[PDB]
């Protein structure tokens, strides 16, 4: 199974939990994904969907989603710990403003000084095939490169290059940012990828429910091809 | 009398701790995340960490 | 519900059975994808060579409708004489009309495909003709009054994907019988991207009976389908540009 | 003396039937389409029509595609 | 050295004629373009109206060969009466036979475009038929005994370039007479990878007409033809897999 | 026209010197290109090409082709002005065996420790958006992404990644690594690049003369379209 | 009185060519194709085609495409 | 006596330069860069530049 930092999930899918239409669409797209493992980020009373939540059954994926230092990083990260509900962090450098993309040097940088204190980190990077590695070269127990920008469901906009990702890493490889439907998330799997994790698709979907039962199928599909065989692209002169 | 989330407030009464602090505000039962001091306080210790009244608390809540 | 000919069908896979490592995997990977409606040839029966296994004598027909094909004509006519044949089978109603027209490429002849769909039509057949995805020439033989339009993805075992979503929408938007994109799929992505284009549904062969784990395989696509036309009726989120 | 799928075959005897005609050749349990002088053989209707002997069938039969 | 019918022409590129800012721009970029071989459409006279430009009536003739088209034509039998026309003209000889199928798309219908360019061949024109990219109706047109062949690399004014490159090519690879690739070219990448690919030209009007500084790019388009051409003929390193 | 480091080159194609078939090849390839800029990297006598060659006309653009560590690369670098022929490096920080992408975390320090001894500097980077900017935001007088792998001319095999480093720097972009035809070539220009750096195309042409034209028009015309107008991607509903 | 593209156009005088006609539409320095009931008229023939007045013509011209 | 690229090797006649020691080689016209002691030394410095003897040189030509 895919099994990142020693522990192991039957659901290759992870589902992002930010914006949903309505709770109540939330609360059921969650159930409908199958995914376990869900990444989470005076004023007056409404219900917050994680305390409406059985804590066994799933698997806290928390972000460092806000910051821009890895300084301003290592905070949300500590802070996650503070609630001790969670026991592995996902690494998240936004820098640039127009297309949400992860800051190599502090990405890099804070994946080092959270490995220290004996933290579950999977980072989220590029495609720089090389800053897959450099990650991961320091006991990085998942690597996790992003197929397009964020919110823009452009799929993976260069296999190739997360082709390499896939045949040089040692741990688990995750696909997120900017999947658009399952022709995308299958994609990720069919080169060798170990899971999606994904938000805006479904969130966004306008029927997150359904389109969250076919991202489900989808990994699945995408992992059995790969799981074995598949037509070489047929060549002619 | 503290630094309290970009104001600056009084606080009834002199003798108090964390888990009182929440009492006034309407989320003793909630989810929050609070820090005294650039210095991160937690679920656990809550009656047990007292108010040196005037410092620095960062209250949080899980938002999308 | 895929309905084709006023017949409907729960499954929107059609999977074909030429060409599997053998008829233990054939009729396991047939089960696997839960595919009502199976493609089948019609060859000559091989009568003075000896005593060989049949993949429909197997079959229990109690579970599939068959659609037999015309492969094998290089004209219309030949085309004919097989639908002709295939009828007289009592099996069968359906007809896909297939006339390979380039010996490499293995892409059809638009003027004998148009030519054979037409008099199958006044011969009463529930009609779908492979066709090519030139966009007028779907139309065209939509005005026939074709029960469904089949255009390829790319060639056929020439396991490529949809080479030209451009026409295939157009295909899509202006149909008026169901599309079912037929050949060229070689991954699930390709299955499911199809159906993502609002395909009404897909038939492929190479791409299970030569995946070299074939039931593996056709349980995959399966859910290709499936994941494709359930992300199509939620709508989803546009490709943001910058 | 027959056209059989386009060899030509001596057929054993002086009168028959297009039902005799395949258990001959053991295929009375085998769909297979029967076609006598381009004309096709509905299957109820084997047991019924006359081999004139000295003339042309093409047996034929569903394979993968 | 490209050459249809018989004739020879030193410039690969095609330039059309339509849908210009200003005649002093359209003059201007076709000079710049090099072109030899312009396509001009056929409309009726607008006799009622007032003295208005046109631009062959500029055009020094001495220095372009005339390619009409049939643009307007929605039937095969109209086609043929706009090539009579054009021809009558005393000054063309080629022919470009246009039957748009569809009005959204402005995608040729298959089975009117081989009609009118046997009428046309029967007749003596110099034939070259604007088609789709169906491999076998190319085939077909051809063995009409078309004078070049005519692919549409996406479509019309749909500045979308090379949208299938493996058509092209069972196209470019069979092709007995030249494959001028015409419709769809958006940028030079395109042009320059129609010809990459071997066509034999590029025809294109809609990415310069339209360009907003189209001299500018006339020049750009000029030099995309001549690069891609040359990096045909020069031989170029494979594309490395892993 | 374009200009790195103060001096400008009315060519926007820089073209390399390895791996021709022939010196009466290479020669001619060269002066064919129109280049200006050309890189660089006991036995028994033969020719050296760059000493059968003017040097006024040309502007040498030297790199550290062999180094892996920074270090083996800065060497390299103050090696080349030990010759005092050239004022202009290229960083290249080849990491990976099996794609020869640069090193995210060499390139950069590297870039930063030859720019303090006032050399110039242009590195070898990937694609990360932000990697880009890292670089260029500590001096870097121009930015030199690759489209795909080094050996194999896949061409730019993500636009939008290299789409977005043009609209966000202020310094010159050339594509280098991976060009195959003119077709590539000219693609570059057309989202705003302000030259092209390439060799395997033409040295191993098997006509790289005539490839070397071609190249020339290429750039030429990409640049044209950029230079203005473009109709657009027309849609349908 | 003629079908002058279409249009239904009384014509000036008695007897006419198709030149003439050109003429007083100010065509005669013009590329165009004319045709006369469905038959293409050859330029080298105006002077001498005659408008047969009440009639069929179509003036035609090249344009940009 | 001097180490050279790779090997151990023989000085003769004691007392030299840089200069000097491109001439018993072959390469006093082409192209070449040369390394006294892991410091790099130049076309500019031949004539002043004196081996002692016991040291490093590597040497280099312009390869593809």
Known sequence: ?237 | MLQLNGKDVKWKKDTGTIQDLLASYQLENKIVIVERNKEIIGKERYHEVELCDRDVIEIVHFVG
């Open chain 1, 1 to 237: 199974m895919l099994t990142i930092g020693g522990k192991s999930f039957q659901s290759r899918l992870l589902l992002g939990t930010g914006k949903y239409p309505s709770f109540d669409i939330q609360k059921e797209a969650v159930a409908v994904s199958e995914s376990d493992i869900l990444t989470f980020a005076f004023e007056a009373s409404q219900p917050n969907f994680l305390e409406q939540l059985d804590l066994s059954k799933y698997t806290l994926l928390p972000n460092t989603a806000g910051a821009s230092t890895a300084e301003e990083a290592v905070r949300i990260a500590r802070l996650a710990k503070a609630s001790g509900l969670c026991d592995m962090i996902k690494v998240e450098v936004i820098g640039c403003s127009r297309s949400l993309l992860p800051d190599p040097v502090e990405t890099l940088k804070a994946s080092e000084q959270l490995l220290e204190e004996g933290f579950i980190v999977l980072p989220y990077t590029s495609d720089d095939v090389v800053l897959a590695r450099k990650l991961e070269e320091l006991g990085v127990h998942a690597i996790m490169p992003g197929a397009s920008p964020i919110g823009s469901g452009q799929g993976i906009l260069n296999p190739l290059n997360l082709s390499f990702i896939i045949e040089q890493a040692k741990v688990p490889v995750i696909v997120d940012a900017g999947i658009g439907s399952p022709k995308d998330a299958a994609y990720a799997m069919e080169l060798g990828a170990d899971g999606v994790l994904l938000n805006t698709a479904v969130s966004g979907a306008d029927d997150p429910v359904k389109m969250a039962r076919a991202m489900k199928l989808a990994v699945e599909a995408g992992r059995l091809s790969y799981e074995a065989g598949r037509i070489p692209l047929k060549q002619y002169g």
